[PDB]
């Protein structure tokens, strides 16, 4: 008798308001200018 | 008797409001100017 | 008789307000100018 | 008879207000100028 | 009969107000100028 | 003058040996029997 | 003059040997029997 | 003149031997039997 | 003139031997039986 | 003229021997039976 | 159980481009010459 | 159980570009020359 | 159980660019020349 | 049980760029020349 | 049980750039020349 | 020769009598109970 | 020859009598009970 | 020859009588009970 | 020849009578009970 | 030849009578009970 419930994972965000530059969840590489 | 329920995963966001620049979920590579 | 519930993990954020520069969840490498 | 509930982990933040520079959750390497 | 509840871990912050420089949760290496 | 190179990210494995059981990269949720 | 190179991130493994049981990279939640 | 190189991050393992039990990189929550 | 190199971070292990029990890198919460 | 090199951080282990019990790097909370 | 979200109101503009004339959000009154 | 969130109001602008003229949010009155 | 969050109000601007003219948030009145 | 958070009000600006003219938040009145 | 937090008010600016003209937060009145 | 006079604008009401219950001029959003 | 006079603007009400319950001119958002 | 005069603006109310309950000119947000 | 005169602005109320309960001109946010 | 005169601004109230309960001109935030 096993019960599992209500589990959550967020990597970057749930709510992103305003981006006036650069938002990157994940980058392996690169050059970011903002 | 196993029950599993209500599990969630979010990588970047649930709600993105306003993008006035650059938003990238995931990049392997590249150049980003904003 | 096992019950597990209400577990959460956040890597970067839940709420990101305003980005006037650069926000990166995770970077393996690169150059970031802001 | 085992019950586990209400556990949370936050790596970087829950609420990020305003970014006028550079915010990086995790970096393996790189150069950051802000 | 085991019950465990209300446990939390925060690595960097819960609330980040304003970033006018550079905020890094974790860095393995790199050069940070702010 | 920005140059970025030779970097990598591995989420689960590069080399996966033989499987007689259950291997899952990512599971949001469920029941796994092996 | 910025140069960034030869860096890596491994989340679970690079080399995974044989499996007769259960191997999961990431699980948000559930029941795992081995 | 900035140069950054040869650095690494390992979250779980590089080399994982054989498995007759249960191996999980990251679990937000649940029941693991081995 | 900034040079940074040859540095490493290991969260759990580099070499994981055989497993007949339960190995978890990170658990937010739950029940582990071995 | 800044040079930084050859340094390391280990959170749990570099070499993990065989496991017949329970090994957890980090647990926010729960019940562990071995 | 009530949830209300992301309602928005803009009176004049979100983005105003270059101005070589006269831009007025609201006036009760007067004389405007461009 | 009530939750209200992210309502926003903008009267004049979020972004105002270069100005070589006359920009007025609100005036009761007067004479404006550009 | 009431939760109210992230309401925002902007009267004139969030971002004002270069100014070679006359920028006024609010005036009861007068004479403005650009 | 009431929680109210992160409400924000901006009257004139968050960011004001270079000024070679006349920038006034609020005036009851007068003569402004740029 | 009441919790109120992080409300913010900005009248003129958070960031004011270089000034070669006249910048006034609030004036009851007078003559401003740039 | 331009003459403009005695013009008027009313948004909600220039004369509000005795009422029972919430009166709201303008709402961007939320829950109103009366 | 320009003459502008006796113009008026009312947002909520120039004359508010005796009421029972919440009166709100403007709300960006929230919960109002009366 | 420009003449501007006797112009007026009222936001909430130039004359507030005897009321019972909360009166709010402007709220960005929150919970109001009356 | 510019003449501007007798202009007025009222935000909340130029004349407040005898009330019972909270009176707030402006609130960014919070909980108001009356 | 510029003449500006007899202009006025009132934020809360130029004349406050006898009230019972909290009166607040402006609050950024908090809890008000009356």
From Swiss-Prot, chains A, B, C, D, E, F, G, H, I, J, K, L, M, N, O, P, Q, R, S, T:
| Effect upon mutating residue 14 to Q | In CAA-APP; Dutch type
Which compartment or compartments is the protein found in?
A: Cell surface
Residue ranges for the region (Interaction with PSEN1) are 16-34
Site residues, Susceptible to oxidation: 27
Give, from the UniProt record, the effect of changing residue 16 to C: Causes formation of an artifactual disulfide bond with PSEN1
Identify the domain of life: Eukaryota
Q: What is the effect of changing residue 15 to N?
A: In CAA-APP; Iowa type
Amino acids binding Cu(2+) 2:
2, 5-6
The entry's stated outcome for residue 2 to F is: 60-70% zinc-induced amyloid-beta protein 28 aggregation
- Carbohydrate attachment residues: 2
Q: How does it assemble?
A: Interacts with FPR2.
Function, please? More effective reductant than amyloid-beta protein 40. May activate mononuclear phagocytes in the brain and elicit inflammatory responses.
Provide the protein name: Amyloid-beta protein 42
- Please tell me the species this chain comes from: Homo sapiens (Human)
Tell me the gene name: APP
